[PDB]
Every structure is written in C-alpha cells, then in structure tokens.
Amino acid sequence: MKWDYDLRCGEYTLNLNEKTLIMGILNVTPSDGGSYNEVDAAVRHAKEMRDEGAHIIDIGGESTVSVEEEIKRVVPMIQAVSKEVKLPISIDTYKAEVAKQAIEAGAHIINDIWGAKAEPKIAEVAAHYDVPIILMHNRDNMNYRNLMADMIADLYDSIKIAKDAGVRDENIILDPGIGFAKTPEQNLEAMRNLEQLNVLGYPVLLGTSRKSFIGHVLDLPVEERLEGTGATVCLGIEKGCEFVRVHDVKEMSRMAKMMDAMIGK
C-alpha cells in the first residue's frame, strides 16, 4: 500500500491502491441554460460512462463567458447527474463562486486548471467545504528555464496557497497539465519524466485525452486519437498515476485494467 488513506468524497469513497481510477469527461453541448435536451443528453452520457468503467464524472462549463451564467449552465447539470448516477462528480472551474454553487448543487471534487492561482479564493472554498481539490500546472507564458524543475516549483506554489487556505494534505491531487502552457515537444518531455511529480507525495491525475500533441506526433485529427491516447494513459499509469481523465471511457478502462494487472497494482 503506497497510500495509507482513502479519498473521501462525501457519500462515496475512492481507494488509491486497488486500481487506476478513471475520470470520464462530460462535455456540456449548450440554448438559454437548463432546458430538457441539454440536461437529458448530459445525463445519459454520464449513465453511459458509468456503465463502461468510470469512477468519477467531470463536468465542465467552457473548453478550448459570464460568471453569473456559467452557474446557471452548470448547476442544473450537477443536480441531475448526482441524483441519477451514483458516482462522485468533480467540477471543472477555476472561479471561486462557481465551485461553491456546484458543491452545493451536489459536486464532490474541485478541478482547477489554474492551480488556485487564477482565483486564490477558490482554495478557501475547497477548505470550507472539505472537498478534494485538483491543482493543475498552468501559467500564462511558456518560457521555462527547466521544464520539470519549473513544473514542480509552480505546482508547489499551488500547494502553498491550498495549504495556507486550510486544505489538508489528504484532499490534494496534482496534475502535470498536459496541453497547458507547453509546446508539443514540451508535452512529450513531461510525459517522459512524469515519475518526478511523485516526489511531492500526492496523488496525481493525468489528462491527455485526445489532445493535439497526440495529433502532432501521429498526424491525425481528434476523432482518430484513440490509440495515441491509449499510449499516454499506459505510460502514465506505469509512471505512477492514480487517476486518468479520458473521453473514451470503455476503451481506456480496459487499458488501465491491463496495466494494473501488469505493474502489480
């Protein structure tokens, strides 16, 4: 057992020794906000992902708009899914106010793509509601002295803000932030040296699903990036990742399960 604690998420509890845990991306196709077609399509997609081996559902407004409206979009979504799919929900925002709404709508984990640097006040919410927060590596420039050395550095400045906010060590997950503020070549390198994040002593989540650096290597558009995704997930798991964040849940679940058998997990 590398991990002497489970991840506590209100009603559900997630073990870190047993299997690589799969986070299924829930999209958000919007058109005022909350109508039947929107929330219906979201629900059967979450249902489908539960059915195919997913352990968490990640609900994200945006991708790549009004704070007051982001809530009106995403609140109803969480209310429905948590009612209809017994599985923890994480909320993909950086905005403080948004997260508060979501946990109170039903969400269980915060997923912040700016590692509490976008709105420091987020970490406080996470602290106040006692939920597990994911801190992703990001930055508004790409001028690294040393890629990995700087990642770990910036990730620490994230932990500093989390910890000073009241966040317990046991609710902290880290993310190398594949695709964010990194060239196609830099993304390959973070993948190559992913094991280093382990020295920080926190669970690590890896999000490479369908991304464009896969496209740059394989020369293949988004709908043909399943195998390349596979590869990222397998190399990830072998380097000690605890979660992976993917679109193609069925396929990626089976690959995790093989890797798991193989590496001893």
Work out which of 169, 218, 221, 222 binds a second copy, going by CB under 8 A. 218
**Among 12-20, 146-154, 171-179, 220-228, the segment contacting ligand XHP (CB under 6 A):** 171-179
Q: Which does 151 bind (CB under 5 to 8 A by kind): ligand XHP, a second copy, none?
A: none
Q: Is 238 in the site for a second copy (CB under 8 A)?
A: yes
The residue whose two tokens read 């988004």 is: 222
Told to judge if 50 belongs to the known catalytic residues of this protein, a careful annotator would answer no
**Which one, 36 or 200, has the nearer CB to ligand XHP?**
200
From 28-36, 72-80, 174-182, 183-191, span contacting ligand XHP (CB under 6 A):
174-182
Q: What residue 261 binds from ligand XHP, a second copy, none (CB within 5 to 8 A, per partner kind)?
A: a second copy
Q: Which amino acid is at 126?
A: A
Among residues 19, 211, 225, 239, the one annotated as catalytic is 211
Q: Which amino acid is at 58?
A: D
175 part of the interface to ligand XHP, by CB under 6 A: yes
Place of tokens 């970490």: 123
- Distance, CA of 264 to CA of 20 (rounded, Å): 11
State yes or no: residue 92 binds ligand XHP (CB under 6 A).
yes
Residue 255 binds a second copy (CB under 8 A): yes
Structure token pair of residue 178: 């594949």
Cβ proximity of 205 and 23 under 8 Å: yes
Residue of 104, 54, 53 whose CA lies nearest to 78: 104
- For residues 247 and 210, the answer to whether their CB atoms sit within 8 Å is yes
The yes-or-no answer on residue 254 being catalytic is no
Among 33, 170, 235, 247, binds a second copy (CB under 8 A): 235
| Secondary structure element (H or E) that encloses residue 91, with its range | strand 89-92
CB atoms within 10 A of CB 80: 19
* Part in contact with a second copy (CB under 8 A); list of ranges 9-17, 132-140, 162-170, 223-231: 223-231
Q: Quick check: 41 and 70 in contact, CB under 8 A?
A: no
Residue from 74, 148, 178, 244 binding ligand XHP (CB under 6 A)? 178
- Kindly state the smallest distance separating residue 167's Cβ from a second copy, in Å: 32
CA angle 160, 118, 22 (to 5 degrees): 80
| Cβ–Cβ < 8 Å for 145, 154 | no
Q: In 115-225, where does DSSP find H-type helix?
A: 121-129, 147-165, 184-192, 212-218
State which of residues 7, 232, 246, 249 lies at the interface with a second copy (CB under 8 A).
232
**For residue 19, what is the DSSP state?**
S
Residues recognised as catalytic = 211, 245
Q: What residues line the site for a second copy (CB under 8 A)?
A: 188, 191-192, 214, 217-218, 220, 227-228, 230-232, 234-235, 238, 251-252, 254-255, 257-259, 261-264
Q: What residues line the site for ligand XHP (CB under 6 A)?
A: 92, 111, 113, 134, 136, 175, 178-179, 205, 207, 245
